[PDB]
From a paper:
Here, an analysis of the binding of the kinase inhibitor H-89 to protein kinase A ([name]) is presented. Their interface forms a deep cleft which constitutes the binding pocket for the nucleotide substrate ATP.
Using anomalous dispersion methods, it was possible to resolve these conformations into two distinct binding geometries. However, although the strength of the anomalous signal is far below the requirements for a successful SAD phasing experiment, it is sufficient to unambiguously localize the position of the bromine moiety of H-89 within the asymmetric unit. Rotation of the C3—N4 bond in the flexible linker of H-89 and adjustment of the following dihedrals placed the bromine moieties of the two conformers into the distinct positions indicated by the anomalous difference map. In either case the bromine moiety of H-89 is not involved in polar contacts to the protein and the discrete positions of its two conformers are likely to be a consequence of constraints imposed by the linker dihedrals. Because neither the overall diffraction quality nor the anomalous signal decayed during data collection, the disorder of the bromine does not appear to result from radiation damage and both H-89 conformers are clearly observable. In general, binding flexibility is associated with adaptability to variation in binding sites, consistent with the broad inhibition profile of H-89 for AGC kinases.
Numbering used by the authors:
A (entry chain A): 4 to 350
B (entry chain B): 5 to 24
Write the structure that this text describes.
């Protein structure tokens, strides 16, 4: 089944060729400077990172709500994330898939870069997962199927995503996944070397400074599925170094409640040996799609959003943020002097 | 239990990406 090249495979191939045509046009001529800060009313912070924050905003002219990522150019420079930030915007403006958050506008001012994306009101998978404890296998399977199709899409465009984790997956009003955080996404044919990601999710080849490819995203998928079904990651400790020792050791233990199909899938994803890792073999993504654990999954129905979600987030009208944690707010200051102009000229 | 060890650990909150 995993090797068989049936008519279904040709349909996927057909779809992906058209998707690549659309992507390359936007890749080669990126949208730039498509809004201004004063067009948006800033409401509330939805998340924070090392070099900025994401805030709920309201677009004045339409009344639509969006999630606006505000990046401090000076902080980006100090953390040596200039190229990664250029990658993030150039890639996100060019992609189009039902499980990828849309970038609606982007622009910059003297101080900051801005990416205005669709607001996804159901909150982070992380929040729901921690609160509930763990997801059932059918629940985790539903989410995992979306990541599988999303990685099939991204990878066909020569993109590596490199930051899969529940914190970067939002749940929409239909209970479907929206992948956010393209900060480490990169278009690369062949090999790359940057040590980036999140410790619990890093493939062993990343931590061992080997040079790596899209197979790191499949390993990260193994970590995500494990964490969703177990309630904890397959490699955890109090400090990152300790996590890395676990990751490289080649040993993984599964909760006693894991189905034997689930265990088998995870052994093939959390496979240190690249000649053996699912997603990285002659059959590519089909080794995953045709695994026993996914027997009940109808891939076309998932793509079409026809499958009933295992839960719908509580929705209390537009602009409601009760699915998100509260963060300290800080006034956006725009310097009277342009910072780091040369470095971000293409943004 | 592994779950109890996880809940008692310092990494059950949001995990930051590593840059440098
Ligand atoms: O609030 S988020 O940021 N949650 C997803 C990632 N977890 C929070 C991390 C935020 C963050 C902000 C700035 C940097 Br620099 C790094 C991380 C977030 C990001 C992008 C789009 C969103 C759409 N709707 C709701 C939230 C959205």
């Amino acid at each position: 089944a995993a090797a068989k090249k049936g008519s279904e495979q040709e349909s996927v191939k057909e779809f992906l060729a058209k998707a690549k045509e659309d992507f390359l046009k936007k890749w080669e001529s990126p949208a730039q400077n498509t809004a201004h800060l004063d067009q948006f009313e800033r409401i509330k912070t939805l998340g924070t990172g090392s070099f900025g924050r994401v805030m709920l905003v309201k677009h004045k002219e339409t009344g639509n709500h969006y999630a606006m990522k505000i990046l401090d150019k000076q902080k980006v420079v100090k953390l040596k994330q200039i190229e990664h930030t250029l990658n993030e915007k150039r890639i996100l403006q060019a992609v189009n898939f039902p499980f990828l958050v849309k970038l609606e506008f982007s622009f910059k001012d003297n101080s900051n870069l801005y990416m205005v994306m669709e607001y996804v009101p159901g909150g982070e998978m992380f929040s729901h997962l921690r609160r509930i404890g763990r997801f059932s296998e059918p629940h985790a399977r539903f989410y995992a199927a979306q990541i599988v199709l999303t990685f099939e899409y991204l990878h066909s465009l020569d993109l590596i995503y490199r930051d899969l984790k529940p914190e970067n997956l939002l749940i929409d009003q239909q209970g479907y996944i929206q992948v956010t955080d393209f900060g480490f996404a990169k278009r690369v044919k062949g090999r790359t070397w940057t040590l980036c990601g999140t410790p619990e999710y890093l493939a062993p080849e990343i931590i061992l400074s080997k040079g790596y490819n899209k197979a790191v995203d499949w390993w990260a998928l193994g970590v995500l599925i494990y964490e969703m079904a177990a309630g904890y990651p397959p490699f955890f400790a109090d400090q990152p170094i300790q996590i890395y020792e676990k990751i490289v050791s080649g040993k993984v233990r599964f909760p006693s409640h894991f189905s034997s199909d689930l265990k088998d899938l995870l052994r093939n994803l959390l496979q240190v040996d690249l000649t053996k890792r699912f997603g990285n073999l002659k059959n590519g993504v089909n080794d995953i799609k045709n695994h026993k654990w996914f027997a009940t999954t109808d891939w076309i129905a998932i793509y079409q959003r026809k499958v009933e979600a295992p839960f719908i987030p509580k929705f209390k009208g537009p602009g409601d943020t009760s699915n998100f944690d509260d963060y300290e707010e800080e006034e956006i200051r725009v310097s009277i002097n342009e910072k780091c102009g040369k470095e971000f000229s293409e943004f | 239990t592994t779950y109890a060890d996880f809940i008692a650990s310092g990494r059950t909150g949001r995990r930051n990406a590593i840059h440098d």
